[PDB]
Amino acid sequence: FTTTNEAFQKVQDAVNNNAQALSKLASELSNTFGAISASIGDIIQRLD
Amino acid sequence: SPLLSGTPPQVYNFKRLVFTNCNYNLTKLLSLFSVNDFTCSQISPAAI
């Protein structure tokens, strides 16, 4: 079970695909889609 | 503190005070006056 093992690399690729799927969800909460902030509680206490 | 002395200048000769690092308690100022018209644009009058 090392880097030269292709099947083991495929196992790790499946795990990494799962992790990337979760990470994309966790990463878009910091995005600011053309707004003044990404936190709803911040824009609430700053504008009208 | 410099706001509370002398003859305040006319409108076209308004003096300026720029604060780039400090902690401000505005109501500790507005308590010293009798506020008459608090109108704000691009941020709520309470949000300032």
Side-chain angles (χ1 to χ4, degrees), chain A, chain B residues 1-27 29-48:
Chain A
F1 297 125
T2 185
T3 80
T4 88
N5 210 331
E6 320 89 292
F8 188 69
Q9 288 327 307
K10 265 191 203 50
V11 175
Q12 190 66 67
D13 298 353
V15 162
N16 286 337
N17 285 352
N18 284 16
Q20 291 327 60
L22 285 198
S23 214
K24 190 166 325 322
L25 274 195
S27 132
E28 290 302 76
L29 282 206
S30 287
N31 209 45
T32 314
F33 312 75
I36 68 141
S37 157
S39 147
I40 281 145
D42 210 31
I43 96 105
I44 265 201
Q45 77 170 350
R46 274 183 51 198
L47 314 184
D48 69 45
Chain B
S1 308
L3 199 150
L4 304 172
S5 69
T7 68
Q10 308 293 319
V11 55
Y12 49 79
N13 210 7
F14 60 102
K15 297 197 185 306
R16 180 176 319 279
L17 286 81
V18 63
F19 309 158
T20 187
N21 197 1
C22 63
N23 297 0
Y24 72 113
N25 188 22
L26 200 59
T27 301
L29 173 58
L30 282 195
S31 171
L32 277 296
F33 282 82
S34 74
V35 58
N36 197 351
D37 186 74
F38 197 111
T39 177
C40 201
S41 179
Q42 305 218 260
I43 196 170
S44 296
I48 207 70

